[PDB]
Design a protein around this ligand. Sequence first.
Ligand code: FAD
Ligand code: FAD
Ligand code: E95
Ligand code: E95
Ligand code: MG
Ligand code: MG
Lengths: 417, 415
Amino acid sequence: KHSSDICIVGAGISGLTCASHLLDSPACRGLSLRIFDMQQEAGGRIRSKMLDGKASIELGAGRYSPQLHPHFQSAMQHYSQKSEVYPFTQLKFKSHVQQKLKRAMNELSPRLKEHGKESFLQFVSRYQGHDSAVGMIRSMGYDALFLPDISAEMAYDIVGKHPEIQSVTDNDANQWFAAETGFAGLIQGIKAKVKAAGARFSLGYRLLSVRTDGDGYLLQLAGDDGWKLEHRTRHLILAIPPSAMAGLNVDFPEAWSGARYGSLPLFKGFLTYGEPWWLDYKLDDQVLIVDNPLRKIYFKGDKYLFFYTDSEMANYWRGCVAEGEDGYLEQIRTHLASALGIVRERIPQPLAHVHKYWAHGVEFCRDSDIDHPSALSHRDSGIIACSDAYTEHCGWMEGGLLSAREASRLLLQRIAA
Amino acid sequence: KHSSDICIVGAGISGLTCASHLLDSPACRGLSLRIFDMQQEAGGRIRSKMLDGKASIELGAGRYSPQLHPHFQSAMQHYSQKSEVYPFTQLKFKSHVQQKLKRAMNELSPRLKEHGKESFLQFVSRYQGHDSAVGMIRSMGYDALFLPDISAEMAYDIVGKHPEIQSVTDNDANQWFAAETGFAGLIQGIKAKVKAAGARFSLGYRLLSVRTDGDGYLLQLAGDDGWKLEHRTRHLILAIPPSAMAGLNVDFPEAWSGARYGSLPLFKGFLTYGEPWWLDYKLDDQVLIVDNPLRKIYFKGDKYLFFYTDSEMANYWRGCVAEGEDGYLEQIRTHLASALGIVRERIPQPLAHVHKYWAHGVEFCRDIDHPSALSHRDSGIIACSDAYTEHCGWMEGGLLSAREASRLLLQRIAA
Ligand SMILES: Cc1cc2nc3c(=O)[nH]c(=O)nc-3n(C[C@H](O)[C@H](O)[C@H](O)COP(=O)(O)OP(=O)(O)OC[C@H]3O[C@@H](n4cnc5c(N)ncnc54)[C@H](O)[C@@H]3O)c2cc1C
Ligand SMILES: Cc1cc2nc3c(=O)[nH]c(=O)nc-3n(C[C@H](O)[C@H](O)[C@H](O)COP(=O)(O)OP(=O)(O)OC[C@H]3O[C@@H](n4cnc5c(N)ncnc54)[C@H](O)[C@@H]3O)c2cc1C
Ligand SMILES: Cc1cccc2c(C[C@H](N)C(=O)O)c[nH]c12
Ligand SMILES: Cc1cccc2c(C[C@H](N)C(=O)O)c[nH]c12
Ligand SMILES: [Mg+2]
Ligand SMILES: [Mg+2]
């Protein structure tokens, strides 16, 4: 095939801003840059859709706060991307159990200078009994907070920047916004700048092997339809997540950093109906955290509802789709009934649904706190890695912006000298 | 119960026909059926896309003959699929290399007796020279005729049985049809009737290995979101082509039949125009066969033109597509000008366009006693495919493997 000077692999937010920071630069004046990505679309873990053509839903990333995500807030304005207020940030539908939870929290919280590295299911079970420490906690909606892998210092953070449970830790100041056309509008924007700057895209292709040959690298990719493709570049950035690099011969994670990483599956499922039936309940633009397997239920206006799930519960939900769409849907009807506390047939059926499951949906720095380089180099061949996961904002979109802007710097200095 | 009675892996026309056979025996009145398929929609190599609204185009199988595909035709009827006449039978512009082989090829035809087990290229390299043979073979437009894997016995078969060059063998009377809506229309009908009888589809899952575990079998499949998954079933049919087969823990093809198998890539590219410009050259519903890369060029009423190639020239066009929409679009215009004997400025730029590379477009046969559906010696699995019939590379090959394989199975539920 062809060849290039720079070769970014991965074309989600970290990959595509990576490239645009390498083109804003004159130190790449008239240099050839190629982007490979696996999917037929650009976006990475960001995906937007129209179901029924009625309203624009988001199968992935959906929220940001300017208070907590400055570079992202700026990247929106930078690309004339119109935001809107994100409704799901207060709870009025609880039973008694989710109440009397902010009180248990604002009190046992500074008692964590003696119980901060421990996982979170016994920092709740050492300061009151277990038979009440699995109720205050699966009342907060994310089953991510029951896994041993990650702690009470990292969990007590995580409760404060998720719009639906932040009122619980002195953080209801922040506003949260959503893209008014969807975050694809932010992607189609960065994509156009990079094309106009003369880069060439190659979507459909997956990297398999890398070998370092003199001044540069020999990539072996494989097309979506089998086409075996070979390509050589002097300079290389793999802006893919950490799970993604485990599968390649790069010595991840050992040759690059002194941290390890996990990841949690996620699951979103969307439904729409003929008539906005949940309105009769004063439930539009509000959110319920129930302890049946739906976990969190959202109604955006009179338009649709969805439900968000994580970790194992996410696997559970991905199990009942392997079983059969119809089996998946009537059981949603079932759980929908015990949440709202009505009978099963007061619940209509959906004209059309749509659902998505993420196998490595959020990847995190597991050696939770460290130097936080924000980008990684090979101790040998000088390949730059680039993910949300290498920053203090593991699992958010601003981590992609930061990892990228850092990454592109290490390569500019690695070219110009 | 994450488990079932009968499992069919492969929702090609083979696999789905098996499902349709099986669900009409009364010996299956009360047995559960699972169909697995890698893709997110059934068909396999039948793939129809409504291009720009103002076109219905066939990226895979496109055409059939009532003379060689009667089981297909009866199926097309059995499901009220309206089919149209398929115009690409004559050649208006037969350069007299095409005409030279007309009456050079059909009279060493009894000389093909006591020969014909020999590369086709060295066959025609016996009447006239090498460079007279390659001129005759080039103008037939099927680069697969130059393979050594191919041989002059199959040669007179393949050239006889394609609608654009049948006029050169003696099967010049077969007639050829396409579908009003598309063969997708036909498979949606089988799938509808298979679903309605009670089969359960799990689409988007692909098989990785099979354990022969006791009564039946355990399968490992992997979805395209990455989710892993196990399935136990008692009766398993692999309705997938042989290339696929040779990548599992089943030892193919030695443990099945001894025969070796090969395949061919294929390419098709389509284009769309503001004004149908090829009508002023009286070119609608014609096909030009050419000695350049495009190879075969079709003009479809006033709707679209496309071109079609295989073997080396499919690999050449997949390799070009890989180097940018810009060059592929440009070489295409370069070679269309040579085809019509004009300058490239008379050829407008297209509005839309689409293309498909099939890595293993047609799979073929190459013991000469082979049934229409294979079986494992050791684990009692049955395989179902166009490739194990007298019709390898055709859809009717699929139907005659399904009816063979599906019956090979009631033979074993009457255990
Ligand atoms: C359900 C869900 C909700 C989320 N909500 C939010 C939110 O509200 N706010 C927020 O800030 N973040 C959110 N996120 C996180 C956000 O999506 C990611 O952190 C961010 O988009 C990651 O950007 P990235 O470009 O580095 O990686 P990715 O988005 O993973 O992009 C990686 C790209 O590299 C590609 N790639 C991988 N491997 C290979 C290979 N071998 N060859 C070729 N190509 C390859 C991938 O296909 C992908 O295109 C959410 C995530 C999920 C799953
Ligand atoms: C470009 C092209 C043009 C053609 N034109 C014509 C024509 O005009 N007339 C004609 O008669 N024939 C034509 N054919 C051939 C015809 O389409 C095929 O011979 C026939 O469709 C084969 O069907 P099948 O059911 O045997 O398997 P396939 O159609 O090959 O389908 C097999 C199915 O199994 C699935 N599958 C495979 N492997 C695995 C695995 N490991 N795990 C899980 N799932 C799996 C595949 O996704 C596929 O859906 C054409 C073929 C091509 C490529
Ligand atoms: C347990 C856990 C750890 C990191 C991330 C998540 C998300 C999704 C992401 N935090 C978001 O909603 O933006 C849900 N659960 C998580
Ligand atoms: C080399 C070879 C062997 C058998 C079959 C085919 C087809 C299929 C046929 N041309 C069609 O599209 O109808 C194309 N090439 C073939
Ligand atoms: Mg990326
Ligand atoms: Mg099949």
